[PDB]
Amino acid sequence: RDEAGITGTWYNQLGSTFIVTAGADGALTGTYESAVGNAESRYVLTGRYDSAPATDGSGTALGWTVAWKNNYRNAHSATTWSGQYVGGAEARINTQWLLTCGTTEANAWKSTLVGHDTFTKVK
Amino acid sequence: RDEAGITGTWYNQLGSTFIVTAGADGALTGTYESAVGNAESRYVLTGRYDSAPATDGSGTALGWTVAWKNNYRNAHSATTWSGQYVGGAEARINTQWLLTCGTTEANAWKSTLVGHDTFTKVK
Amino acid sequence: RDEAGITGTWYNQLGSTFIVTAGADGALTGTYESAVGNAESRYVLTGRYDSAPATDGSGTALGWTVAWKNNYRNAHSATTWSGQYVGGAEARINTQWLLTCGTTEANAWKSTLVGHDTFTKVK
Amino acid sequence: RDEAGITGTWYNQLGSTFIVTAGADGALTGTYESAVGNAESRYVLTGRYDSAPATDGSGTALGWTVAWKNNYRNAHSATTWSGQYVGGAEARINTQWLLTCGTTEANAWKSTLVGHDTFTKVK
């Protein structure tokens, strides 16, 4: 259980901030602030993590979603990050993400961006 | 707002069942039962959707996460679906997903599956 | 060996045409015409396929790339499709694709679209 | 045109070697040796790149495919890398990839791995 390991403030390579609380059940709840894109200030995030990982040195699977609507902006889109928390002295959250925009069925073929974010506790 | 449109029971092409409640804020909460993989019975899911989409015929962006641990099994993994709800008489949720397994850093390059699921209200 | 199975003209769900010749070695060469996007007429494609698949009913892995430059347009981008050929009476090529645009390092986080195309011999 | 920029030997974060020749037309041809997975020695690769990129500081889109069959092994699979070449003193090829295995239609939902590789001229 990496409840304490995961809970807190994280930073990615683009300068975004991810603030999360991990529940004893597997819940993730928090806020995301993006350094890039059609976004300003904090956005709600919710997700899930494996609260009883293997003890064989494997990482801890986790994922979360941000819908890019808050009181300031609505970018009609949602990103999900899927990845794993790895602990120890250079602790990291390594993810791949999918960002889907709401589109017309005509433009659905260009609705989805794919990328990868590495989060750390420092920067 | 597709709060009522989204809320309810959905089925995908593999025979999985997705049961969700959409909140007025943008919350998604529910259960997922997979027809395939290292899974049995219901798993908690949580996510987010755009509660005020464009009115120009575009779909409604949304996403959610399942961590594949419940009282019966723990597959040390998590899937996130990112997509859009499209309403009208053949209503669909069209998604792409990322499934990450917890791995050793040696095997991280083979940690993540990518696929696509279409959900409908019928089948 | 699905050299003859693969060689010929294929159509996807968006109305694109994929014309390919499969070599005895594993080569794929041909042309792609996209029904959507910043594209007109034929574009060169090249790729690879598994020329000696398993005989246990598994599909045949394959992939190919189009750079979206020809004599008519240059969209400064490239799509790769990765997938498998499945034979028999409703023969299909099932793929997922990544389309990368050339970008500034500032915009690299939004350089890559992900999707899925199903090709058939008819439509 | 980054024909000379691209042509040569490249190394990724996993210790793989990518040896490529870029043609004046847009062709890529070469060999790939993987440091990980069900692979040994060199595998043919073929692909495409944008031979006349924008001059506005954007990268050069490119992609290529390896089918994992050679004289030593056949892993019934194919990887495609889609990405962009960025020049200058720390020159990089930044990619995302899809690796599809041939599967039964029953197991198609778990056929495809997604990842990201950064290649450099040194290491």
UniProtKB/Swiss-Prot annotation, chains A, B, C, D:
Stretches of the chain forming a coiled coil according to its record: none
GO CC list: extracellular region
Motif (Cell attachment site): 48-50
Swiss-Prot/TrEMBL keywords: Biotin, Secreted, Signal
Binding site for biotin: Y32, Y43, W81, W97, W109
GO molecular function, one term: biotin binding
Domain Avidin-like: 3-123
Function (record text): The biological function of streptavidin is not known. Forms a strong non-covalent specific complex with biotin (one molecule of biotin per subunit of streptavidin).
Name this protein carries in UniProt: Streptavidin
Species of origin: Streptomyces avidinii
